[PDB]
Design a protein around this ligand. Structure first.
Ligand SMILES: NC(=O)c1ccc[n+]([C@@H]2O[C@H](COP(=O)([O-])OP(=O)(O)OC[C@H]3O[C@@H](n4cnc5c(N)ncnc54)[C@H](OP(=O)(O)O)[C@@H]3O)[C@@H](O)[C@H]2O)c1
Ligand SMILES: CC[C@@H](C(=O)O)c1ccc(-c2cncnc2)c(F)c1
Length: 305
């Protein structure tokens, strides 16, 4: 249940999202990530910004120790935060992440966002990200990351890397917000044309953080069409939203800190949607990105409109 990447490595098509707001204790990320691996998750999504890499690393190592999984069976992702985009900071930031997680390599390292910040939430900065990508390329050559990609890149920002003079490695993936209300069908078409995997976050709609998400926005999992399809298939609305991405070639993440819902989310491989189901879901696209805050929308390299 993996997809082959542009650089030869493989990525599991269902990933586990580990972000919890700072009010959730970090000991939960350790328990939860162990349960995700117990449930069948082999793709685990973390980042510098998430303040959990020590716990997520320990969880992986703990399951490696108890004879459940081997390191080569786990796909660990980290992300370079936007205060570290200047090239001389890229490798130290990655080495720090491996340090926190106590791992020898990450399977995937991403530029978290194209919106550079002053060298964690400072003020904007102006960085030529082709130089940041060059430092990413060296992290792959050095073996600190098996694969390298980007996150929150729009079409123009992706093209800049692919058009870079003397590019070494193209981005393996682009991790963007993607769900039935914001399905990125044009960006998905472009990524499939360049052999770039689209990885979807907020596929269950969001954690609806009051910092960045308007509480007046519709709740994706309460959508009428998704709920009717859940009743039709005798599944849950979350499983329909996840199966929707797998059937259109999108690697999908799913955060859950609930034992029961983590186990339920791996049932996405058990059933299929029909062609009629898929256009029902495609008709829900309404250009609604849940993350909508002036802090993002004021940045010069803001990927949206
Ligand atoms: N690159 C980026 O900029 C970026 C941005 C955002 C997120 N991400 C990553 O993507 C991951 C997922 O995105 P997300 O944080 O927005 O969370 P999400 O995957 O969209 O899930 C949203 C909510 O759905 C609930 N849920 C999980 N399974 C469910 C189920 N079977 N039925 C009903 N509800 C269910 C969860 O609540 P419970 O916990 O109570 O189960 C969760 O809080 C993140 O953890 C992060 O790793 C990356
Ligand atoms: C902790 C929150 C974090 C995450 O969960 O990864 C996150 C969430 C949203 C964005 C983002 C990017 N580009 C446009 N709008 C929003 C982001 F860069 C980073």
């Amino acid at each position: 249940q993996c997809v082959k990447l542009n650089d030869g490595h493989f990525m599991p098509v269902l990933g586990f999202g580990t972000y919890a707001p700072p009010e959730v204790p970090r000991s939960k990320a350790l328990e939860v990530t162990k349960l995700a691996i117990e449930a069948g998750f082999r793709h685990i999504d973390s980042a510098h910004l998430y303040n959990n890499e020590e716990q997520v690393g320990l969880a992986i190592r703990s399951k490696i120790a108890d004879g459940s999984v081997k390191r080569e069976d786990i796909f660990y992702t980290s992300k370079l935060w936007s205060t570290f985009h200047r090239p001389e900071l890229v490798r130290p930031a990655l080495e720090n992440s491996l340090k926190k997680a106590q791992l020898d390599y990450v399977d995937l390292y991403l530029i978290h966002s194209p919106m550079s910040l002053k060298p964690l939430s400072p003020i904007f900065d102006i960085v030529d990200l082709c130089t940041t990508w060059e430092a990413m390329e060296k992290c792959k050559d050095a073996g600190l990351a098996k694969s390298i990609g980007v996150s929150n890149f729009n079409r123009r920002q992706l093209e800049m890397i692919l058009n870079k003079p003397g590019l070494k490695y193209k981005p393996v993936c682009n991790q963007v917000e993607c769900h039935p209300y914001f399905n990125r069908s044009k960006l998905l078409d472009f990524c499939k044309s360049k052999d770039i995997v689209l990885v979807a976050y907020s596929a269950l709609g969001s954690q609806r953080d009051k910092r960045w998400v308007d509480p007046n926005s519709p709740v994706l999992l309460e959508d009428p069409v998704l709920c009717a399809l859940a009743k039709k298939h005798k599944r849950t609305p979350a499983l329909i939203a996840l199966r929707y991405q797998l059937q259109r070639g999108v690697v999908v993440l799913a955060k859950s800190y609930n034992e029961q819902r983590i186990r339920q989310n791996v049932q996405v491989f058990e059933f299929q949607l029909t062609a009629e189901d898929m256009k029902a879901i495609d008709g829900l696209d309404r250009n609604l990105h849940y993350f909508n805050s002036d802090s993002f929308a004021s940045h010069p390299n803001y990927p949206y409109s």
